[PDB]
Amino acid sequence: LVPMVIEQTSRGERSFDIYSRLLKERVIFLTGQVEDHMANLIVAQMLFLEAENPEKDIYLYINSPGGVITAGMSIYDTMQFIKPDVSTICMGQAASMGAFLLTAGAKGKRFCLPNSRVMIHQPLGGYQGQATDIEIHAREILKVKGRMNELMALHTGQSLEQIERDTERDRFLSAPEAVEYGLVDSILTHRN
Amino acid sequence: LVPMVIEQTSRGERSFDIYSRLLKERVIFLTGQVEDHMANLIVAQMLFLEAENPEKDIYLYINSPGGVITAGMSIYDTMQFIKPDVSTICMGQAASMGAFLLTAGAKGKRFCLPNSRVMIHQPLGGYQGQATDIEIHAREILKVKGRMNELMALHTGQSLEQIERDTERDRFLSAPEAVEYGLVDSILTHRN
Amino acid sequence: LVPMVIEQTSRGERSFDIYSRLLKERVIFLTGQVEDHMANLIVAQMLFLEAENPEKDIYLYINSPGGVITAGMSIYDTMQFIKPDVSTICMGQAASMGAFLLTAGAKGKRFCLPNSRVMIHQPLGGYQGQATDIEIHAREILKVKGRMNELMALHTGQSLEQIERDTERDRFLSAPEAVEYGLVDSILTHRN
Amino acid sequence: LVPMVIEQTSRGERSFDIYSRLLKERVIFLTGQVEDHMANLIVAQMLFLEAENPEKDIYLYINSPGGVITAGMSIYDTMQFIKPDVSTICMGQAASMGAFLLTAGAKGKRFCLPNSRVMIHQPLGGYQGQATDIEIHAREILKVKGRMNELMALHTGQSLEQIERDTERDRFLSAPEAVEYGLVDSILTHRN
Amino acid sequence: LVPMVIEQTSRGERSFDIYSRLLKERVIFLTGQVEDHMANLIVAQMLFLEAENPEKDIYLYINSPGGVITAGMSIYDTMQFIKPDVSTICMGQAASMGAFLLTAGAKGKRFCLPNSRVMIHQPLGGYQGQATDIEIHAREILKVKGRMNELMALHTGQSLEQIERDTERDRFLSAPEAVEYGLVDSILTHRN
Amino acid sequence: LVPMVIEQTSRGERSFDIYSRLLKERVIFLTGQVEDHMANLIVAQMLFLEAENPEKDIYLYINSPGGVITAGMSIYDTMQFIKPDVSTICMGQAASMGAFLLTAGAKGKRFCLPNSRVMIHQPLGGYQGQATDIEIHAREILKVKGRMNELMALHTGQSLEQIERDTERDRFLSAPEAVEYGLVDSILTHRN
Amino acid sequence: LVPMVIEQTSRGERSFDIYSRLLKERVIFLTGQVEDHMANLIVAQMLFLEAENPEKDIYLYINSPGGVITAGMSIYDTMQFIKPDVSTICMGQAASMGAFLLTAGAKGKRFCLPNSRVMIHQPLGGYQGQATDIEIHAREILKVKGRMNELMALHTGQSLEQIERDTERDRFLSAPEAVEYGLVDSILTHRN
Amino acid sequence: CGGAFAGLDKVISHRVETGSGIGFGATVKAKSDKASEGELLAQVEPEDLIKFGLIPEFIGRLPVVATLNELSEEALIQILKEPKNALTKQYQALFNLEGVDLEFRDEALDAIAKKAMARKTGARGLRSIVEAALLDTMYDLPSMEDVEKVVIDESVIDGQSEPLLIYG
Amino acid sequence: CGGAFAGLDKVISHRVETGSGIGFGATVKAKSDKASEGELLAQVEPEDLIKFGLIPEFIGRLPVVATLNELSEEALIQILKEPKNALTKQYQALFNLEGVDLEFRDEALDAIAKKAMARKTGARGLRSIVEAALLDTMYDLPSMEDVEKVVIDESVIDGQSEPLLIY
């Protein structure tokens, strides 16, 4: 169930869902696992806001344990393509793919909550079949791992060698450590 | 099924669901297990009330057996970030995470019903894999346990050593004991 | 499916569901098992009626085989907190928790149908784990049983010793016996 | 799916569901098994019709294979409490509990279709547990069986001894035999 | 999904579902298995059309593999009770119960499509229990088989002895044979 | 999910589903398996268009892997009964029953897409029971096979002997071969 | 859940779903597996845009892991039949069938995101039955493989021999390689 | 009898287009073959007016019908020069009493025609183009002295420059 | 003919301030940074009014158009001092018959302007702010004697203080 709210306007009263009301203010929610359906829905929201206003900042709240890689990369390329600065915020947790979209936000407009948590690891996969087919899928996932590390260094500012060593296994980063690591810019402790 | 009500206004008559009517009065309901979808819904409600009025107190009624920790911490950080004082009330039961959001409310605006019950214990988890990965997930959950005890002491006023001993196992606290423990401020026995 | 009705008013014609029409007259329905979702819905209904009119009696029709205890105690504390007298009526059956909310109504405004049936027994539970944890959950359910018997005596007027003996096992009470037992005030045989 | 109809009125055109249209004419449908949810819905319909008009006859069409006893007794007490005469009609089949509500209608306003069929048997139950608990539930179901036979004799006019012998096992009664048995008053073969 | 259509009227434009539009023209659809819910819905449609106009013919299109017997007999008695002539048409298939409602239509207003197919057999049943109970349910289903053959002969005009031999096992009848058998009157090959 | 469209009209703006908009233009969609519910829905659409305009061509797009035979024959007889010419188009695939409705369209108004595919085989069935019953169902399905081949020859123009040999086993026919086979008239490669 | 948006127009305010809003601007979303229902839905969208404007470019965003072949070929033939140029964009991933619709777009109006990925392989199938039937289904799937390679060469410009060798097994193509391969025209890195 | 029938083009289009064109076979020319309003009125008939609201009995009393074409860029230039009651000659006389001459070059007329057609008002929507431009000039023309002639250039209509003034 | 047109600006804004689609390829026009009610109405045209509801024939009868800039905070202060019909001059003459002087310092006028714009009432609902402050002063003015001047400070508007009276 989703509660309904009333947005008081000069023309009259209108009824909106809680998610649609925040969308009017350039706010998008990324909840749960990243899949093809959920990812394609967020893309339509960004494009809709671009046409309405290309000079106003967009806010993206992320609370997700990650998911499919291909579904997440569609959002990353979209944020970089559009002119508006996509501000990112981490609420609760940010896994491998949730962390990549977090750091991919506009420089200087990335925040993490005081008790938020980030986790990064390498891409996961698997295949069953002939040895010739396993080699193909192995080369493909290796390119993604290399590609995901190159972009992570670009936004985080760290070196490619450091990201390779830190992403070999699961690595949790608290909110203060994320600032020192270049993943985010500051922490939104209180409203000033 | 959700009953529909009529809110008599000067402009005209409007039909609202029972949950949406209370939302208009800065009242949010926390029911069932705390998950990523249910937690992300309450966050949108708090933000909507912040924009409408940042100086009016919010009331949060909690009746939940607890759930995921990361889903609950997104609500706690939100309550502290926004300016309005989030009043909390315990109805029926308040588990580990439900209790943490209860005491995290604004000081002096925390209540517990005469027959309500609070329960607190340590974080639960588990992992299956290599020994190297178990050590990583063990260090992470240990930090959360330490972090959850530090904040519990901050709002309850007790010492960190006391919270560690009391949270080693399940501990039930009646409504009178919660007041003496600093978890709440008073009891709403009758309406005066 | 829910049938729709038309409420003829001076302003115009309006369409309502059968459950919403009775809500307008300060009538709430308690159907099925008592759970956290169904219990949290009735609480919002009582508060809505309190604001509309705090001096008019509320009627609560109960037809339920019982359920969770914590979900039911949230309703009991609410009825006692609010000023209006919550009249209770038993339709079909009233189990352990359904009977507790039945007798908790306002004194003198409790009724039972001529063929209704009430059943009372002790709290049910269980646990699996270490012996130290079993002792904790056993002490907790014992307090509830003692607390539920204390409140039952307060509204029924009987002694605590009598409730302990009568609640050791399942005990069915016919409609005439409920009046003699202090559980209710009268029987609504016919409309006078 | 439910078809929608248009009720031509002087004020204007209004759209109604097929079930809601008949409700406006004091007609209620009893379909499927008798349970707590389906039974609690019909009770609200009867009360709504009582307030609209207490002097107009109500028509109750029953097509059900029976179900829970406690759910059905809530309907029986309601029909006797309200002043309007609840006319009953049997369509398709009327099982043990469906037959009790059929004969419970107002005397002289009970009908059965030419090819309808009524079936009556004894209450069904069961329990698993200690011998002391089995004796309690056995005494309770015995009282219901005795109570259901007493009321059956009251409306059918037969003696209590006859109902006990006929309800020991399943007994099917055709439409002509039901008239001779006092269960109904006449048969609605054709519209005159 | 159900397509929506627009009925151009003098009062204004109205949106209707495909099933509701045909109901306005005295057309009812009998699709799928015959059960208590689907049967109880069609009965309300017939009564609604009777009140609107008792002198206009009703059309009943049947495409069903049959189902419960008691659910189907409620429709048959209704068609005979009401004054309007219930025209029947066979589309696709007409099983045992679908065939009984087909032939039960008004004489001279029964049709079958050129490629439709009718199937007739004896009632199906079963029981598990004591030998005394098996004899009761066996006598009941035997009466229905005899009763269903008597009515089949009345509308088809054949003798009871012929129906008994033809219904001993499954018997399929093409569209031309149905005319020769008295089940229908003609075939609607083309629109003249 | 179904997208909504706006049909600009002189009276005003109206919102329609994508399927309902095309229905207004005498366009029906046949998607998925052919069953009793999906087949009974298309029949109501054809009849609705017949009354609105009996001189305008109807277009039927078919993309289906086939299904029940009795459900499909109801559509075939309807297309032949009504006066308007039902144009058929094959999109994606046309199985045994989908092919029969495809070729059953009006002569000269049958088309197949350049990459569409048609498949034809014999009717499928089965039965379990006594040997006497197996012989009955075998004779019935044999009549259908003979009946389905006779009609296929009538519209395709081929001889009955040729259809019997070609339908003994699965036979796929490309779009060019379908024209040479008399199944269709032409191909809609481009819009001229 | 689907967010609702408001399209500000001179006539007034209108509420639209996010998918319907983009449809007004000649934008279609292809998400998830390609099936008969999802494919038949996109065809109606293209036709609706064709009637509204035959001279404006259509944009098709594809994010899909592929699916049924016959469902996808209906879309390909439609894009070539209609006059408007169907622009295609690859978001996230483009499997065998998703890649075929991507390259089938209008020449010069095909794009791929910087991090998108394309995968191509041969048709998949299987059958169980007699040897005579396996040979039939084997010849059919062989024609499709040959037919799918012929069209792939036509739009990509490569030779048929090259497509046969590259499609023998799974082959992943990055965004830069797709341009060199003739599959797409350029990359939409930033908005200029 | 005469009156501009608003919306008469939409009803005539249904009679002359003959198709919606949502189907495969039906042709679709949304804008390439879109009907022209001028030409469309020529194809009017009495049956078309019945849908509009007129009664057949009323039209039978008026057999003759006269359809008028919309203004054209070339026609607007002639309206300001050939007619004696043209707006250009009106302002010419407005300043003649003041002892000042007025002029209108051809470069300004071509720009005025394009601005008037966009307004979708016709000849009556021309004064808005003229008076809106000469507002500032007329406001301070009486106060000025020794001014005998005024020239209005194409730029004046666009608003980039001001109308040149001559001194005697 | 003259009158306020509520909702018109939205109609003109939508037409004038947009040339973009919502898709990827369509370019996005950056515009409408500020509401600009005064500068937006200046860009009006007859076609914009047709969407609002007016008929083209009626607009043809009215070729000239005029756009009135809205009110500003500093504009209100000038309205109370320069024109002869200013309310300050009205109340000044109201007390002149009583042989008493009146004053209005700028510290009070600038504060009144903030109150008016907060009310969203405009210059017409400006009296309510003035008369609400001078209610008690006027009520006991006739009975008071030997008073020759009254000064209204900024505090008086807030209500913390009372106007200073000189004897």
Residue numbers in the entry:
A (entry chain M), B (entry chain N), C (entry chain H), D (entry chain I), E (entry chain J), F (entry chain K), ...: 2 to 193
H (entry chain D): 247 to 414
I (entry chain E): 247 to 413
The authors write:
We describe here near atomic-resolution single-particle cryo-EM structures of single-chain ClpX pseudohexamers bound to ClpP and protein substrates. These structures show how asymmetric hexameric rings of ClpX dock with symmetric heptameric rings of ClpP and reveal how the pore-1, pore-2 and RKH loops of ClpX function in substrate binding.
The structure of the ClpX∆N hexamers in the class-1, class-3, and class-4 EM structures were very similar to each other (pair-wise Cα RMSDs 1.2–1.9 Å). The hexamer in the class-2 structure was generally similar (pair-wise Cα RMSDs 2.6 Å) but differed in the position of the 'seam', a dilated inter-subunit interface that occurs as a result of ring closure. This seam was located between subunits A and B in the class-2 structure and between subunits F and A in the class-1, class-3, and class-4 structures. The class-1 and class-3 structures also had density corresponding to a roughly globular native domain above the channel. For example, substrate was contacted by the pore-1 loops of subunits B/C/D/E in all classes, by the pore-1 loop of subunit A in class 4, and by the pore-1 loops of subunit F in classes 1 and 2. In the symmetry-free maps, the unoccupied pocket in each ClpP heptamer was always located between the pockets bound by IGF loops from ClpX subunits E and F.
